[PDB]
Amino acid sequence: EVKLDETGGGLVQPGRPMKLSCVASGFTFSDYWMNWVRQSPEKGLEWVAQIRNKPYNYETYYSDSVKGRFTISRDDSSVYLQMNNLRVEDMGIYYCTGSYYGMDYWGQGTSVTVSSAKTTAPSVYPLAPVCGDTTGSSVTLGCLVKGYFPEPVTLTWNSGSLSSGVHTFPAVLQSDLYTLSSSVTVTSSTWPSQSITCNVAHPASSTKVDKKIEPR
Amino acid sequence: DVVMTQTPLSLPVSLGDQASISCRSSQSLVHSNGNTYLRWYLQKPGQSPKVLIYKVSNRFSGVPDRFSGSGSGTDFTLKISRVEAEDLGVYFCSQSTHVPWTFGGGTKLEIKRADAAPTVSIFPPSSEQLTSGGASVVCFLNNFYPKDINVKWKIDGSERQNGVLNSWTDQDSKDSTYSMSSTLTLTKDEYERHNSYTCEATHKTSTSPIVKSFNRNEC
Numbered sequence: 259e260v261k262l263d264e265t266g267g268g269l270v271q272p273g274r275p276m277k278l279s280c281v282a283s284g285f286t287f288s289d290y291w292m293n294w295v296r297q298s299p300e301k302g303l304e305w306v307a308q309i310r311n312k313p314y315n316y317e318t319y320y321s322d323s324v325k326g327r328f329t330i331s332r333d334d335s336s337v338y339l340q341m342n343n344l345r346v347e348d349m350g351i352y353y354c355t356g357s358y359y360g361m362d363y364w365g366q367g368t369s370v371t372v373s374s375a376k377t378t379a380p381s382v383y384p385l386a387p388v389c390g391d392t393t394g395s396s397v398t399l400g401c402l403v404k405g406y407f408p409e410p411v412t413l414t415w416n417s418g419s420l421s422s423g424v425h426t427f428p429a430v431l432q433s434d435l436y437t438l439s440s441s442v443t444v445t446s447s448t449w450p451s452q453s454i455t456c457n458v459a460h461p462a463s464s465t466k467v468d469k470k471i472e473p474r
Numbered sequence: 475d476v477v478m479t480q481t482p483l484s485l486p487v488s489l490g491d492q493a494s495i496s497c498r499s500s501q502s503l504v505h506s507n508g509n510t511y512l513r514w515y516l517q518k519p520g521q522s523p524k525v526l527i528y529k530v531s532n533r534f535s536g537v538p539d540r541f542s543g544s545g546s547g548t549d550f551t552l553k554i555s556r557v558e559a560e561d562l563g564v565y566f567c568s569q570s571t572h573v574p575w576t577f578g579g580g581t582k583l584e585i586k587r588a589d590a591a592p593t594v595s596i597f598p599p600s601s602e603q604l605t606s607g608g609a610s611v612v613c614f615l616n617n618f619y620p621k622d623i624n625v626k627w628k629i630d631g632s633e634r635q636n637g638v639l640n641s642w643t644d645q646d647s648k649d650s651t652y653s654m655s656s657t658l659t660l661t662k663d664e665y666e667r668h669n670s671y672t673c674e675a676t677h678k679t680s681t682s683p684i685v686k687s688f689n690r691n692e693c
């Protein structure tokens with residue numbers, strides 16, 4: 259019944275700071291060491307900072323990389339991390355951990371996005387099979403969602419009726435803006451005999467686009 | 475900075491199989507106090523790491539008995555006796571004997587299946603995009619196994635680095651295959667100065683590259 263629930267994440271323009279709050283809710287906060295760990299876009303788990311207790315004279319430890327910019331603190335209940343001078347390299351998921359006699363409890367995590375970019379609507383393009391040539395039994399169609407910001411787009415195929423044979427690739431940050439793509443594999447019976455439409459939403463810029471895949 | 479090296483990085487298994495993962499420390503994990511602070515974590519997708527094992531061989535409350543940890547000094551082993559679906563993820567070892575606390579790179583547990591070559595599709599820029607002064611050439615490499623694959627962009631037979639965006643799916647639930655997206659972005663000017671555009675994929679499934687190409691003039 260140990261509970262950690264961090265808060266305080268979002269976008270941050272580099273050079274600028276942010277303050278992360280974790281309220282440890284189901285133990286003797288005083289007896290535990292508190293920590294800040296982050297996970298980078300890849301396979302990179304990173305220990306950031308540590309705040310000990312009374313017995314250990316509330317010592318504080320920090321990873322090389324945040325030393326002089328972040329401050330862990332406790333409210334004997336809660337722990338805070340003041341992130342100052344935010345660079346891009348500090349972008350990742352941030353988790354709060356409660357440590358005690360070898361064991362460790364982790365919260366949910368909070369995402370911290372560091373980017374200069376502002377809200378930008380995506381450009382959606384239809385990807386039809388090759389410059390009027392060779393394709394079609396079973397044809398593969400695609401949809402390209404280029405340069406949007408921030409974080410969340412939704413892509414559907416035929417308003418979500420067509421679910422099988424579709425692949426949706428995770429968005430990747432191409433120098434300050436995201437790009438997403440999706441493929442759908444149908445049969446030559448189906449296309450272009452039928453209608454194949456890519457449906458895209460970018461709530462943050464209020465966009466809702468519907469793009470039909472037409473033989474190129 | 476104690477180095478936690480984790481082996482292997484990927485471990486294909488079948489459900490019901492036994493799996494073992496190793497971890498090595500650079501320095502001894504033995505604390506003056508006598509404790510060995512080595513932990514094992516499992517991270518299922520979309521969730522945070524949960525500890526399975528702490529202080530080498532203590533299984534946390536509520537963790538199935540199919541998980542066990544062993545080792546001493548700088549050699550540690552994690553053991554799953556009967557792999558179940560809910561066991562698939564990424565396993566990390568971590569030491570907390572020395573500051574800073576440190577972690578190993580991860581070991582992914584994934585389903586084993588027969589090798590399958592990628593189905594490659596190439597897509598010239600859409601009219602809508604050229605109209606904007608950009609030209610994105612896309613290549614999908616779908617349903618292949620194992621995951622390891624290399625993709626090369628060639629323009630008029632010369633290799634192109636710069637402007638390539640790659641994206642990968644996660645092991646498919648249905649068939650256990652991986653998919654990948656490679657997009658090369660050029661200016662419309664560039665796209666109009668060259669003719670031959672090729673996507674070449676190197677995969678264990680074949681000795682020679684898998685090539686997919688188009689000629690702009692023939693568009």
Ligand SMILES: O=C(O)c1ccccc1-c1c2ccc(=O)cc-2oc2cc(O)ccc12
Pocket residue numbers: 289290291357358359360361362505507509511570571
């Ligand atoms: O292991 C302890 O004696 C201990 C007890 C309560 C709180 C913290 C620790 C603790 C450590 C105490 C002293 C020390 O020198 C090293 C400690 O390392 C720890 C590592 C943990 O993962 C988790 C906890 C510790």
